[PDB]
Design an enzyme around this catalytic site. Structure first.
Site, mmCIF file in Angstrom:
data_model
loop_
_atom_site.group_PDB
_atom_site.id
_atom_site.type_symbol
_atom_site.label_atom_id
_atom_site.label_comp_id
_atom_site.label_asym_id
_atom_site.label_seq_id
_atom_site.Cartn_x
_atom_site.Cartn_y
_atom_site.Cartn_z
ATOM 1 N N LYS A 44 -73.984 123.416 101.609
ATOM 2 C CA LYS A 44 -74.347 122.272 100.594
ATOM 3 C C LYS A 44 -75.705 121.643 100.908
ATOM 4 O O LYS A 44 -76.023 121.389 102.334
ATOM 5 C CB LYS A 44 -73.257 121.468 100.425
ATOM 6 C CG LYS A 44 -73.841 119.982 99.900
ATOM 7 C CD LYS A 44 -74.047 120.299 98.448
ATOM 8 C CE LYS A 44 -74.585 118.832 97.648
ATOM 9 N NZ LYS A 44 -74.801 119.296 96.115
ATOM 10 N N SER A 45 -76.736 121.370 99.991
ATOM 11 C CA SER A 45 -77.925 120.827 100.493
ATOM 12 C C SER A 45 -77.682 119.680 100.981
ATOM 13 O O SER A 45 -77.157 118.743 100.612
ATOM 14 C CB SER A 45 -78.697 120.959 99.176
ATOM 15 O OG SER A 45 -79.497 121.826 99.017
ATOM 16 N N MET A 70 -74.092 115.792 90.709
ATOM 17 C CA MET A 70 -73.288 115.463 91.990
ATOM 18 C C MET A 70 -74.063 114.308 92.434
ATOM 19 O O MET A 70 -73.259 113.458 93.143
ATOM 20 C CB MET A 70 -73.097 116.466 92.789
ATOM 21 C CG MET A 70 -72.611 117.975 92.185
ATOM 22 S SD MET A 70 -70.830 117.694 91.489
ATOM 23 C CE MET A 70 -70.003 117.542 92.977
ATOM 24 N N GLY A 71 -75.455 114.305 92.697
ATOM 25 C CA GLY A 71 -76.012 113.335 93.322
ATOM 26 C C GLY A 71 -76.151 113.447 94.978
ATOM 27 O O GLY A 71 -76.090 112.673 95.566
ATOM 28 N N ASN A 128 -84.613 123.248 99.521
ATOM 29 C CA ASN A 128 -84.270 122.847 97.915
ATOM 30 C C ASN A 128 -85.465 122.351 97.548
ATOM 31 O O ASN A 128 -85.549 120.990 97.596
ATOM 32 C CB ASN A 128 -82.962 122.389 97.960
ATOM 33 C CG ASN A 128 -82.386 121.903 96.473
ATOM 34 O OD1 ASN A 128 -83.381 122.257 95.639
ATOM 35 N ND2 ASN A 128 -81.496 121.531 96.238
ATOM 36 N N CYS A 131 -85.391 118.795 95.390
ATOM 37 C CA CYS A 131 -85.227 117.530 96.017
ATOM 38 C C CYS A 131 -86.058 116.636 95.348
ATOM 39 O O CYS A 131 -87.279 116.611 94.696
ATOM 40 C CB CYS A 131 -85.486 117.457 97.482
ATOM 41 S SG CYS A 131 -87.314 118.295 97.726
ATOM 42 N N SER A 196 -80.155 124.824 88.764
ATOM 43 C CA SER A 196 -79.476 124.194 87.472
ATOM 44 C C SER A 196 -80.447 124.036 86.403
ATOM 45 O O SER A 196 -81.497 123.461 86.785
ATOM 46 C CB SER A 196 -78.532 123.365 87.605
ATOM 47 O OG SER A 196 -79.044 122.230 88.102
ATOM 48 N N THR A 273 -71.299 128.547 89.356
ATOM 49 C CA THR A 273 -70.028 128.010 88.458
ATOM 50 C C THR A 273 -69.117 129.035 88.673
ATOM 51 O O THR A 273 -67.910 128.463 88.632
ATOM 52 C CB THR A 273 -70.786 127.924 87.040
ATOM 53 O OG1 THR A 273 -71.661 127.018 86.989
ATOM 54 C CG2 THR A 273 -69.479 127.648 86.257
HETATM 55 C C1 LIG Z 1 -71.371 121.453 91.536
HETATM 56 C C2 LIG Z 1 -72.725 122.176 91.810
HETATM 57 C C3 LIG Z 1 -73.387 121.869 93.111
HETATM 58 C C4 LIG Z 1 -74.765 122.319 93.109
HETATM 59 N N1 LIG Z 1 -75.158 121.810 94.373
HETATM 60 C C5 LIG Z 1 -76.401 122.430 94.523
HETATM 61 C C6 LIG Z 1 -77.019 121.888 95.832
HETATM 62 O O1 LIG Z 1 -76.508 121.253 96.710
HETATM 63 N N2 LIG Z 1 -78.175 122.451 96.290
HETATM 64 C C7 LIG Z 1 -78.763 123.396 95.351
HETATM 65 O O2 LIG Z 1 -79.848 123.734 95.915
HETATM 66 N N3 LIG Z 1 -78.210 123.797 94.563
HETATM 67 C C8 LIG Z 1 -77.171 123.370 93.999
HETATM 68 N N4 LIG Z 1 -76.565 124.083 92.549
HETATM 69 C C9 LIG Z 1 -77.213 124.983 91.808
HETATM 70 C C10 LIG Z 1 -76.672 126.251 92.101
HETATM 71 O O3 LIG Z 1 -77.028 126.793 93.271
HETATM 72 C C11 LIG Z 1 -77.001 127.152 90.631
HETATM 73 O O4 LIG Z 1 -78.258 127.401 91.209
HETATM 74 C C12 LIG Z 1 -76.717 126.848 89.417
HETATM 75 O O5 LIG Z 1 -75.562 126.109 89.378
HETATM 76 C C13 LIG Z 1 -76.758 128.022 88.409
HETATM 77 O O6 LIG Z 1 -76.086 129.154 89.020
HETATM 78 P P1 LIG Z 1 -74.725 129.358 88.260
HETATM 79 O O7 LIG Z 1 -75.039 129.600 86.983
HETATM 80 O O8 LIG Z 1 -73.850 130.435 89.283
HETATM 81 O O9 LIG Z 1 -73.683 128.071 88.239
HETATM 82 C C14 LIG Z 1 -75.078 123.280 92.309
HETATM 83 C C15 LIG Z 1 -74.511 123.708 91.162
HETATM 84 C C16 LIG Z 1 -73.263 122.999 90.876
HETATM 85 C C17 LIG Z 1 -72.538 123.569 89.531
HETATM 86 O O1 LIG Z 2 -76.148 117.788 94.004
HETATM 87 C C1 LIG Z 2 -76.522 117.788 93.107
HETATM 88 O O2 LIG Z 2 -76.492 116.884 92.325
HETATM 89 C C2 LIG Z 2 -77.365 118.973 92.787
HETATM 90 N N1 LIG Z 2 -76.950 119.472 91.581
HETATM 91 C C3 LIG Z 2 -77.651 120.677 90.947
HETATM 92 O O3 LIG Z 2 -77.406 121.421 90.062
HETATM 93 N N2 LIG Z 2 -78.861 121.107 91.749
HETATM 94 C C4 LIG Z 2 -79.092 120.695 93.017
HETATM 95 O O4 LIG Z 2 -79.970 121.014 93.439
HETATM 96 C C5 LIG Z 2 -78.350 119.474 93.269
HETATM 97 C C6 LIG Z 2 -78.987 118.766 94.410
HETATM 98 C C7 LIG Z 2 -80.316 118.443 94.325
HETATM 99 C C8 LIG Z 2 -80.249 116.919 93.891
HETATM 100 C C9 LIG Z 2 -79.837 116.454 92.742
HETATM 101 C C10 LIG Z 2 -79.816 115.130 92.518
HETATM 102 C C11 LIG Z 2 -80.196 114.206 93.063
HETATM 103 O O5 LIG Z 2 -80.066 112.815 92.873
HETATM 104 C C12 LIG Z 2 -80.863 111.881 93.518
HETATM 105 C C13 LIG Z 2 -80.475 111.422 94.858
HETATM 106 C C14 LIG Z 2 -81.474 110.582 95.556
HETATM 107 C C15 LIG Z 2 -82.669 109.963 94.718
HETATM 108 C C16 LIG Z 2 -83.045 110.559 93.469
HETATM 109 C C17 LIG Z 2 -82.162 111.553 92.978
HETATM 110 C C18 LIG Z 2 -80.761 114.585 94.709
HETATM 111 C C19 LIG Z 2 -80.838 115.984 94.915
#
Ligand SMILES: Cc1cc2nc3c(=O)[nH]c(=O)nc-3n(C[C@H](O)[C@H](O)[C@H](O)COP(=O)(O)O)c2cc1C
Ligand SMILES: O=C(O)c1[nH]c(=O)[nH]c(=O)c1CCc1ccc(Oc2ccccc2)cc1
Ligand SMILES: Cc1cc2nc3c(=O)[nH]c(=O)nc-3n(C[C@H](O)[C@H](O)[C@H](O)COP(=O)(O)O)c2cc1C
Ligand SMILES: O=C(O)c1[nH]c(=O)[nH]c(=O)c1CCc1ccc(Oc2ccccc2)cc1
Lengths: 313, 313
Positions: A44-45, A70-71, A128, A131, A196, A273
């Site tokens: 997880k990032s 998710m944030g 990532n 960010c 996403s 997903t």
């Molecule tokens: C619940 C959830 C959490 C995710 N968290 C991250 C994340 O923490 N860091 C990141 O780079 N991408 C995150 N993604 C993006 C996924 O890696 C992916 O690129 C995106 O969901 C599209 O792939 P999928 O079509 O298989 O869902 C997240 C996606 C989902 C649905």
């Molecule tokens: O964890 C996620 O919300 C998420 N979901 C995705 O589909 N892709 C992602 O890369 C991530 C993590 C990237 C992300 C998404 C929202 C975020 O929300 C903020 C948090 C702090 C400041 C500003 C935005 C921060 C990082």
């Protein structure tokens, strides 16, 4: 006939792994993924400081895909570094560590301490680039100025081979410009397309309501919604970045999705997903499904068809 | 009971219409569209001189939606203006004319000539800001200063109320910026969200080939793929443009897809990919289903739920 790959000086049983965010936040999660048939996993990032993330509901799924905001809920870098450092069983399968600092300086500190573990254990970095930056600006990958800054700085700081997780682009000039930035940086060894699809909005017909609480229901799309956009980005970047590997992520539900992804030029193939929905049993199915696609077509290895999508005339 | 509404000093039998490009290029098509139950129609986007467009195949549809890269095939602005002025029966429904000229000057020349026919005959202008941009730059709506000039110049040229066709954005900061630009212009009284999702890529697993000929297989996405993108954009702009209307477009197959669109702030609901596959009969079905959704819920008017999507606190 095998799914095997050697890339970035590591050995993989198959091209399949989870997508950052899915089944990788906790040690329980990380060990599950490691116990699966995936050829790899990615954490997880993370951020320096632990985060609880946004209010629930913050992820919802449907027949055609997922929406999330998710944030950045995460256990914070020290845990994710400790797991790479002392907990993970590299004899099982390689580990990727995702980072998503909320500024250039947060990311820089993290890679500095990650460096010596990468070197000594083989843990691999997925920066990532979705960010956040200063709020009121696009995420770092939609701001090619900040994107340049972040990679200049992380290269100097890390000085090892790493990778970038990109959002989707939708305009040719954007593919052009983004690959051009990436290509300034030799240490970017791989590129993951895509994150996403930003800020979709799913509305429930019976309740007349958004389905997720943060951001007035706006959030990232994954699943069957995004697979064509996912293949475009893979192949754009496969085309424009010849010294760098591409890893595909985007609506993989089946060996066929995987197969198409590889055709576009994917090396590893991440499941977001679908993995969340189906669970880790998905990876055996995917492996079997792709292998039954290659058997029928005569393919013995992935390199025989990777990047070899045909065009018309 | 019945969905009839009033927008822009016009009467409509229901909020439904085709999407620019679909069933609207030929006199034949526009007579067909006119003869249908749609509340309104719009003509294929056009250029000063006629265009043949790109090599076929350049449109394909599959269960989840469509990909295209038509290349702006069109009979040319002289024809469409003739249709608008000498051939359309305005007692049947209102007509919307789409222009997608290759430059600000191409667009200016057309609106100057269109404004007199708008005055007298009441045709309505939908300007397509997915129109071309200068060398090395993305489409106009993805380059906000260029977008400001197009509106500054068209407003000066046309000087009657008109509307704009937007591609989807995927970032809050882009919504913020894009909306602001649009609010600089009081003549822009409606905004149509969204255009096709730029530069997807459908790959066929059996042939190992892309499916459309131009752009090495890359084109715009319509259909079930983009519905959660079209609702965020409908709603994003509805909230940020209080003094304007919003027309929804993208992923309508049913009354329910329509209902949600309206819930998201949409006044007119456009139909494209589903119109192109099912034919103009779809409009009788879409009426019936929406009317049936309204009955179950006890809604008598679109006004009653337009823009009323519920947030979770
Ligand atoms: C619940 C959830 C959490 C995710 N968290 C991250 C994340 O923490 N860091 C990141 O780079 N991408 C995150 N993604 C993006 C996924 O890696 C992916 O690129 C995106 O969901 C599209 O792939 P999928 O079509 O298989 O869902 C997240 C996606 C989902 C649905
Ligand atoms: O964890 C996620 O919300 C998420 N979901 C995705 O589909 N892709 C992602 O890369 C991530 C993590 C990237 C992300 C998404 C929202 C975020 O929300 C903020 C948090 C702090 C400041 C500003 C935005 C921060 C990082
Ligand atoms: C074959 C085809 C031609 C189109 N031509 C145009 C056009 O000339 N101008 C325009 O603004 N949009 C055009 N579009 C986009 C549609 O008006 C609409 O934005 C898109 O199809 C999304 O709606 P859907 O989800 O119903 O397909 C076209 C779409 C298709 C599939
Ligand atoms: O006609 C289309 O291909 C089309 N498809 C869509 O999904 N949305 C649209 O808005 C359009 C028409 C807009 C358009 C599409 C391609 C164009 O191709 C070019 C022609 C000349 C120079 C650069 C691009 C020009 C305008």
């Amino acid at each position: 006939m095998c799914l095997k790959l050697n890339l970035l000086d590591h050995v993989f049983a198959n091209p399949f792994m989870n997508a950052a965010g899915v089944l990788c936040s906790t040690e329980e999660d990380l060990r599950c993924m490691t116990a699966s048939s995936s050829g790899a996993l990615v954490s997880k990032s993370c951020t320096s400081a632990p985060r609880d993330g946004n209010p629930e509901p913050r992820y919802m799924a449907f027949p055609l895909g997922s929406i999330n905001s998710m944030g950045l809920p995460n256990l914070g870098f020290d845990f994710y570094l400790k797991y790479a450092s002392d907990l993970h069983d590299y004899s099982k399968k390689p580990l990727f560590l995702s980072i998503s600092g909320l500024s250039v300086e947060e990311n820089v500190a993290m890679v500095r301490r990650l460096a010596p573990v990468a070197q000594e254990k083989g843990v691999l970095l997925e920066l990532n680039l979705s960010c956040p930056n200063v709020p009121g600006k696009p995420q770092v990958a939609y701001d090619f100025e900040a994107m340049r800054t972040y990679l200049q700085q992380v290269s100097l700081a890390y000085g090892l081979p790493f990778g970038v997780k990109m959002p989707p682009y939708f305009d040719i000039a954007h593919f052009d410009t983004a690959a051009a930035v990436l290509n300034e940086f030799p240490l970017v060894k791989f590129v993951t397309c895509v994150n996403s699809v930003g800020n979709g909005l799913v509305i429930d017909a019976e309740s007349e309501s958004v389905v997720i609480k943060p951001k007035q229901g706006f959030g990232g799309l994954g699943g069957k919604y995004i697979l064509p956009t996912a293949l475009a980005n893979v192949n754009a970047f496969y085309r424009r970045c010849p010294d760098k590997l591409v890893f595909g992520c985007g609506g993989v539900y089946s060996g066929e999705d995987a197969f198409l992804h590889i055709l576009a030029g994917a090396s590893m193939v991440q499941v977001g997903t679908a993995l969340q929905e189906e669970g880790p049993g998905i990876f055996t199915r995917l492996e079997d499904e792709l292998l039954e696609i290659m058997a029928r077509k005569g393919y013995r290895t992935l390199e025989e068809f990777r990047g070899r999508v045909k065009t018309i005339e």
